[PDB]
Design a protein around this ligand. Structure first.
Ligand SMILES: [Ca+2]
Ligand SMILES: [Ca+2]
Ligand SMILES: [Ca+2]
Ligand SMILES: [Ca+2]
Length: 162
């Protein structure tokens, strides 16, 4: 239940200082195939700042992304992820896209890691992850590589405001 947030933040702050600056969130959102501007950063920060210092605290961020609960379901975030991942939007995610997404954020991953991820997310084993199966990662992926999909999903889920 809380693990989602714990990891969502853990993967966010790499310095592990106990806060997130415009720099972090900036690259985090920009690494998701988006083009965030200074306004977006300053906005979010000032939007998640209870004191007004220009920094993201521990509970602050949690509350910010927590707003997602407001939505009837997490479908929006889900589709949004698989949608932002597929640069071509062909309807499937290739090792390339996923890899770039992990590397961009700065998530050290090995050939085996990504390989297994796609191997688990792809039942047909066509080297492409579809949405239909992509959602299955949350339907009992305990034995699967749900880990990776979770981290990436959390980053792309929190990176946004919706
Ligand atoms: Ca920081
Ligand atoms: Ca603060
Ligand atoms: Ca593709
Ligand atoms: Ca497939």
């Amino acid at each position: 239940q809380i693990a989602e947030f714990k990891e969502a933040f853990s993967l966010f702050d790499k310095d592990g200082d106990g806060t997130i600056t415009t720099k972090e969130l900036g690259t985090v959102m920009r690494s998701l195939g988006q083009n965030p501007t200074e306004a977006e950063l300053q906005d979010m920060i000032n939007e998640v700042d209870a004191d007004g210092n220009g920094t993201i605290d521990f509970p602050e961020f949690l509350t910010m992304m927590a707003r997602k609960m407001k939505d009837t379901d997490s479908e929006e975030e889900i589709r949004e992820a698989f949608r932002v991942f597929d640069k071509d939007g062909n309807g499937y995610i290739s090792a390339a896209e996923l890899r770039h997404v992990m590397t961009n954020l700065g998530e050290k991953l090995t050939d085996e890691e990504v390989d297994e991820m796609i191997r688990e997310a792809d039942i047909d084993g066509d080297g492409q992850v579809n949405y239909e199966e992509f959602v299955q990662m949350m339907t009992g992926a305990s034995t699967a590589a749900g880990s990776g999909w979770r981290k990436i999903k959390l980053a792309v889920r929190g990176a946004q405001a919706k």
